[PDB]
């Protein structure tokens, strides 16, 4: 049975800590960006070479793309439309990689030599991603770019490790966060929040670096938390950060969940307790990311949190109501029909 109240309590706390509230991001602007990002991406993924080197089921690509654009537009609120579009493509590539069962070994045998010689990579994924990377990198300074490149490389190894469906050896306490950081894209996400057009990598080096280090853990743990509901009974999903704590540390799913909430809540508090008295433009980007990121989760049908809403909408409980109050907040600005932006389907663009 799902820890419905415990979950609710933790969710409301996280929200208060981060100061979850209303933004000046109008539903009309969201639709403007949503359609803009989706429109550049669908046309990209619809090109021939893309269509033939990126092995993904058409229906899942469409879904993945819509999910990713949703997350970007809603979290990288302050960057430009082009930046959202370009980050949408890169994060859709990374999402798509989890669909491969194919062992990377054979295609990674000459990874370095091909890289150093300027020859196209053997693994089709790497071929598309490195070819398109400049489009994403042009929006950043050398420091931030370096973070993206590294994180994406970590991501690749993360996916490789996961093909083994390995939650860790009982007793290997370091395995869980090791794996979560590899497939997390923490430094990618974190360093992509600062476009050299609205920020100065050098003048803000300390804050940017710090953000990356704190955002890496907030971003991944918040996702682990919000996802805890859909993954609860997913017998297919076997190696989540929480399921690994269970196996690696040898504790109950409950205790594992306790560790996650403790880390998440704390991560939140320190985030706030560090950026408030910091360059406003910076705290704004950070604060907006947190809120949008949370909105997206509550709104995307992928996380099915509306099921929880529908099951506690009527209760005189303090949390139960605080949750709904929050939920309806995100709903009012985030519940947009895909028909208003995500069109036409990638498949149709590719067939033309």
* Cα→Cα distances 137→12, 216, 287, 339, Å: 36, 19, 23, 30
* φ and ψ at residue 140, rounded to 5 degrees: -135, 170
Longest dimension (CA), the chain: 66
Burial of 131 from C-beta contacts in 10 A (0-12 / 13-18 / 19+) = middle
Contact between 100 and 60 under an 8 Å Cβ cutoff? The reply is: no
18 known ligand binder: no
239 known ligand binder: yes
CA–CA distance, 202 with 226 (Å, rounded to integer): 35
CA–CA distance, 106 with 122 (Å, rounded to integer): 9
Q: Which residues contact 290 (CB under 8 A, 6 or more apart)?
A: 18, 20, 218, 271
Contact between 79 and 139 under an 8 Å Cβ cutoff? The reply is: yes
75 known ligand binder: no
197 known ligand binder: no
* φ and ψ at residue 283, rounded to 5 degrees: -60, -30
306 known ligand binder: no
Reference 299, options 257, 331, 340; nearest CA is 331
CA–CA distance, 179 with 239 (Å, rounded to integer): 10
Q: Which residues contact 251 (CB under 8 A, 6 or more apart)?
A: 245, 259
237 known ligand binder: yes
Contact between 98 and 91 under an 8 Å Cβ cutoff? The reply is: no
Residue 306 belongs to domain with CATH number: 1.10.600.10
Q: In sequence order, what DSSP letters do the residues of 7-75 get, joined into one string?
A: HHHHHHHHHHHTT----S--HHHHHHHHHHHHHHHHHHHTSHHHHHHS---HHHHHHHHHHHHHHHHHH
Residue range of the domain that includes 110: 1-352
* Cα→Cα distances 237→51, 72, 229, 233, Å: 28, 24, 12, 9
Burial of 82 from C-beta contacts in 10 A (0-12 / 13-18 / 19+) = middle
Give the total number of structural domains in the chain.
Answer: 1
162 known ligand binder: yes
Instruction: Resolution in Å, one decimal, please.
Output: 2.8
| Experimental method, per PDB record | X-ray
* Eight-class DSSP state of 121: P
Q: Which residues contact 277 (CB under 8 A, 6 or more apart)?
A: none
CA–CA distance, 60 with 65 (Å, rounded to integer): 8
Tokens of 269: 């508090």
CA–CA distance, 170 with 220 (Å, rounded to integer): 23
């Amino acid at each position: 049975n799902f820890p419905t109240e415990y979950f609710l309590n933790t969710t409301v706390r996280l929200l208060e800590y981060i100061r979850y509230r209303d933004s000046n991001y109008t539903r009309e602007e969201r639709i403007e960006n949503l359609h803009y990002a989706y429109n550049k991406a669908a046309h990209h993924f619809a090109q021939p070479r893309q269509q033939q080197l990126l092995k993904v089921d058409p229906k899942r690509l469409q879904a993945s793309l819509q999910t990713i654009v949703g997350m970007v537009v809603y979290s990288w609120a302050k960057v430009s439309k082009e930046c959202m579009a370009d980050l949408s493509i890169h994060y859709t590539y990374t999402l798509v990689l989890d669909d491969s069962k194919d062992d990377p070994y054979p295609t990674m045998v000459n990874y370095f030599d091909d890289l150093q010689a300027g020859r196209e990579q053997a693994h089709p994924w790497w071929a598309l991603v490195n070819e398109h990377f400049p489009n994403v990198l042009r929006h950043f300074g050398p420091f931030c770019s370096l973070n993206l490149i590294r994180s994406t490389l970590d991501f690749f190894e993360g996916c490789w490790i996961e093909q083994y469906n390995f939650g860790g050896f009982p007793g290997s306490h370091d395995y869980p966060q090791f794996l979560r950081r590899m497939n997390g894209l923490g430094h990618c996400v974190g360093a992509s929040l600062w476009p050299k057009e609205q920020f100065n990598e050098r003048s803000l080096f300390l804050e940017i670096t710090s953000a990356i280090a704190q955002m890496e853990n907030w971003m991944v743990w918040v996702n682990d938390l919000m996802s805890f509901y859909k993954e609860f009974d997913d017998e297919r999903d076997q190696i989540s950060l929480v399921k690994n704590y269970v196996v690696s540390d040898e504790i109950s799913l409950h205790e594992a969940l306790e560790k996650l909430t403790q880390d998440t809540l704390h991560s939140s508090k320190q985030m706030v307790a560090v950026f408030s008295d910091k360059d406003p433009q910076v705290m704004d980007t950070i604060e907006c990311f947190m809120h949008g990121y949370v909105t997206w989760h509550l709104c995307d049908r992928k996380y099915r949190l509306s099921e929880i809403y529908e099951k506690v909408k009527e209760e005189k409980t303090e949390d139960a109501q605080k949750f709904c109050k929050f939920y309806e907040q995100a709903a009012n600005v985030g519940a947009v029909s895909p028909s208003e932006w995500a069109y036409p389907p990638v498949a149709q663009l590719a067939n033309v």
